[PDB]
Amino acid sequence: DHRFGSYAAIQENALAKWYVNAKGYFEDVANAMEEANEEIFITDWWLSPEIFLKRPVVEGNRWRLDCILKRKAQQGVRIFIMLYKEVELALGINSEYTKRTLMRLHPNIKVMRHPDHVSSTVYLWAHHEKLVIIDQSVAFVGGIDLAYGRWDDNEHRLTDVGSETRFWHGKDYCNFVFDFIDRYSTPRMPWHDIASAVHGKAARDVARHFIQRWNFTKIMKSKYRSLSYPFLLPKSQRYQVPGSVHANVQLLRSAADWSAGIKYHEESIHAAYVHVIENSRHYIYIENQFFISCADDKVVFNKIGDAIAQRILKAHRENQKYRVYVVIPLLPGFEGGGNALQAIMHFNYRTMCRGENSILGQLKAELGNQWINYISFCGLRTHAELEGNLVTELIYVHSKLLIADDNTVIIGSANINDRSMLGKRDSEMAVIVQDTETVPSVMDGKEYQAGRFARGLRLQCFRVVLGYLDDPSEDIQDPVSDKFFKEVWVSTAARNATIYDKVFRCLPNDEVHNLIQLRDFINKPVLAKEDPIRAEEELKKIRGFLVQFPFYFLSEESLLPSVGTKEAIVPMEVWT
Numbered sequence: 196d197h198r199f200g201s202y203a204a205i206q207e208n209a210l211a212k213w214y215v216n217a218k219g220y221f222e223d224v225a226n227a228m229e230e231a232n233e234e235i236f237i238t239d240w241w242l243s244p245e246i247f248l249k250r251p252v253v254e255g256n257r258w259r260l261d262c263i264l265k266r267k268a269q270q271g272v273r274i275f276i277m278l279y280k281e282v283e284l285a286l287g288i289n290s291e292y293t294k295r296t297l298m299r300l301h302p303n304i305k306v307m308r309h310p311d312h313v314s315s316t317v318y319l320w321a322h323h324e325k326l327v328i329i330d331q332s333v334a335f336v337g338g339i340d341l342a343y344g345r346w347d348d349n350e351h352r353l354t355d356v357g358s359e360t361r362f363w364h365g366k367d368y369c370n371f372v373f374d375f376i377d378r379y380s381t382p383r384m385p386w387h388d389i390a391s392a393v394h395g396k397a398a399r400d401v402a403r404h405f406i407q408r409w410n411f412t413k414i415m416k417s418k419y420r421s422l423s424y425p426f427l428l429p430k431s432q433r434y435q436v437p438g439s440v441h442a443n444v445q446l447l448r449s450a451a452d453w454s455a456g457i458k459y460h461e462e463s464i465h466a467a468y469v470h471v472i473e474n475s476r477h478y479i480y481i482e483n484q485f486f487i488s489c490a491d492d493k494v495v496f497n498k499i500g501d502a503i504a505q506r507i508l509k510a511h512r513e514n515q516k517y518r519v520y521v522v523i524p525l526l527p528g529f530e531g532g533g534n535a536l537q538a539i540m541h542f543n544y545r546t547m548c549r550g551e552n553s554i555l556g557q558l559k560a561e562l563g564n565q566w567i568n569y570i571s572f573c574g575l576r577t578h579a580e581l582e583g584n585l586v587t588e589l590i591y592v593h594s595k596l597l598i599a600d601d602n603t604v605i606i607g608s609a610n611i612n613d614r615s616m617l618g619k620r621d622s623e624m625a626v627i628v629q630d631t632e633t634v635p636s637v638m639d640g641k642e643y644q645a646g647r648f649a650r651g652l653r654l655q656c657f658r659v660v661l662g663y664l665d666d667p668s669e670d671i672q673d674p675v676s677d678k679f680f681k682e683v684w685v686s687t688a689a690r691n692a693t694i695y696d697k698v699f700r701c702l703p704n705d706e707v708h709n710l711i712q713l714r715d716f717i718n719k720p721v722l723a724k725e726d727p728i729r730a731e732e733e734l735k736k737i738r739g740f741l742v743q744f745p746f747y748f749l750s751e752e753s754l755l756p757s758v759g760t761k762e763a764i765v766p767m768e769v770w771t
C-alpha cells in the first residue's frame with residue numbers, strides 16, 4: 196500500500212550518495228563501521244572475511260573486514276550477519292567456514308545462514324541482496340558484495356605484480372572468465388559495479404527489511420533446533436558520510452514467503468524499472484550483469500525488455516529524440532563447454548537481437564534498420580602489458596544500474612532477469628532516487644535543469660567507459676545530442692571493438708558463428724604477439740573501455756541440443 200507496492204514509503208528529502216566501483220564504496224563502509232555505536236547489519240551472497248576495505252594497504256590489518264568487525268564487536272557493538280547458504284555442489288563458496296570464522300572473533304558477532312540445510316524443502320533461489328546497515332542510521336545498498344574480486348578503481352587494471360603497490364592480495368586477485376590463477380602469466384578480471392548509500396529514515400527502511408528476515412529465519416530455524424540468538428527490533432523516530440546530497444529516496448525489494456516470510460510476494464524493484472522506463476522523457480542508461488527480458492509468458496516473464504522497445508516506438512511515433520544505453524558483460528561470469536554460460540548467453544541474445552520477440556525484432560518490424568538512432572548495446576574491454584607480453588581481458592560489469600533523464604536513478608543488486616525481478620525468485624533489494632536539487636545542464640542542445648545526484652552519476656559513468664576521466668570532458672555534457680550519441684558513444688564503441696579484434700583476435704566475435712569456427716579462429720596467428728610494436732602503437736588509439744556488443748557470436752549454435760539430455764530434470768526457468 197505504498198508507491199510501486201513497496202514496503203517502504205517515499206522518504207522525501209533524505210541523504211543519499213552514489214558509488215562508482217567498490218574502492219570508494221568499501222572505504223566509506225569501513226569509515227562508517229568504525230564509528231558504529233550500537234549495531235551493524237550485514238547480509239551478503241558471498242562474504243570474504245580477510246579483504247581490505249581501504250587500499251592501498253594502509254595501517255596493517257586495521258581495515259581488513261574481519262578485523263574491522265572484530266574491533267567494533269569488542270566495544271560492545273552487536274554485529275549481525277546474514278549469509279546465503281550455498282548449494283552443496285557449490286565448491287567455491289564455503290559459508291560454513293566464514294560462519295565459524297566470523298563468530299570465532301567475538302561473541303558479539305552472530306551469523307545466520309539461509310536457506311536451511313536441515314530443511315526437507317528444496318530451495319532453488321538465493322539471497323542476492325547486499326546491504327550493510329550501521330545503527331539503522333546509515334545503510335549501503337548496491338550490487339557489490341564484500342567478497343574477493345569486487346574492489347576496483349576507475350582504471351580497471353589487469354596487472355598487479357608490484358611489491359609498485361600490490362592492490363589485490365592473494366585470492367582477491369581472480370579471473371572468473373574462461374587451479375589458482377598465475378598472477379604473472381594471466382591477467383585478472385576487473386570489477387565494474389555500482390552501489391549507493393542512504394541515511395535517516397530511509398536507512399531505517401533498509402533495517403526493517405533486515406529485521407524481518409532475521410526474525411523470520413530464526414523461527415524457521417527453530418522448527419529443527421533452538422537458537423541462542425536474539426530477536427531484533429526496528430529503531431524509533433547522528434552520522435553522515437561526506438559527499439551526500441539531498442533527494443527523494445524510496446527502498447525497493449524482491450521478497451517472498453520462503454525468503455522474508457511475507458504473505459504476498461513483493462516485486463517493487465520490477466515495477467519501478469517499468470515505471471521509470473515508461474515515464475522517461477529523454478534517455479535511459481542501463482548497466483546490468485544480465486539482459487534477460489522480452490516476456491513470452493512461457494519461460495521469461497519480466498516486462499523490462501518489452502517496456503524498452505515499446506518506449507522507443509513511442510519516440511519514433513512522436514518524432515521525439517530518444518537514446519537508450521545498454522551495457523552488459525561480453526560474457527557471463529562462469530568458469531563454449533559450460534552449462535550456465537550457454538544458457539545465459541542464449542536468453543541474453545534472445546532479449547537483444549535473436550527472435551521476433553526480441554527488442555530489435557520489435558523495433559525492426561516497424562522502423563527497420565533505423566533502430567541505430569535510438570538504442571545501443573555495448574560491453575567493456577581493456578588491455579595491458581604483462582611480463583613483457585600484451586594481454587587483454589573483458590571488464591565484467593556486475594552493476595545493476597538504471598538512470599533516466601538526469602533526474603531518476605535506480606541502484607541495487609537485482610539483475611534484469613526473472614530471477615531478480617519476479618520477487619518470488621531470488622531475494623533482491625534496490626533503491627530509487629529522484630532528484631530535487633537542480634543544476635544547469637544541457638539536453639538536446641537546449642538548456643536543461645538536471646538533478647545533482649543523477650547527472651553527477653551519469654557524468655561519472657560516462658567518463659569511465661568513454662575515456663574522458665581526468666580530462667576536459669567537453670563533449671559528454673549533453674547525453675541525447677546527435678553529436679554525442681553518434682560521434683562519441685557509438686563511434687568510440689565501434690572503434691575499440693575493431694581494434695581489439697585486429698590486435699588481439701579476442702572472443703566474443705560477431706565473425707564466429709559456430710563452435711567449429713571457434714577452434715580455427717583461435718589457432719590463427721595473433722597480431723599482438725607476432726608484431727608487438729605495431730600492436731602497441733595501434734592500441735594507443737583506444738579511448739575508454741566501451742566496445743560494441745557482438746550480435747552474431749555463436750549465432751548458428753542452438754541451446755537445446757548442446758545443453759539438453761535424453762531425460763532432463765532441471766527446469767529451464769532456473770537460468771532465466
Ligand SMILES: C[C@@H](CN1CCC2(CC1)OC(=O)NC[C@H]2c1cccc(F)c1)NC(=O)c1ccc(F)cc1
Nearest residue numbers: 241287288321323371484528529610612614769770
Ligand atoms: C563473478 C560472479 C558471477 N556469478 C554469476 C551467477 C550469480 C552469482 C554471480 O549471479 C547473480 O547475479 N546472482 C546469483 C548467481 C546466478 C546463478 C545462476 C543464474 C543467475 F541468473 C544468477 N561469480 C562469483 O561471484 C563467484 C565466482 C567463483 C566462486 F568460486 C564463487 C563466486
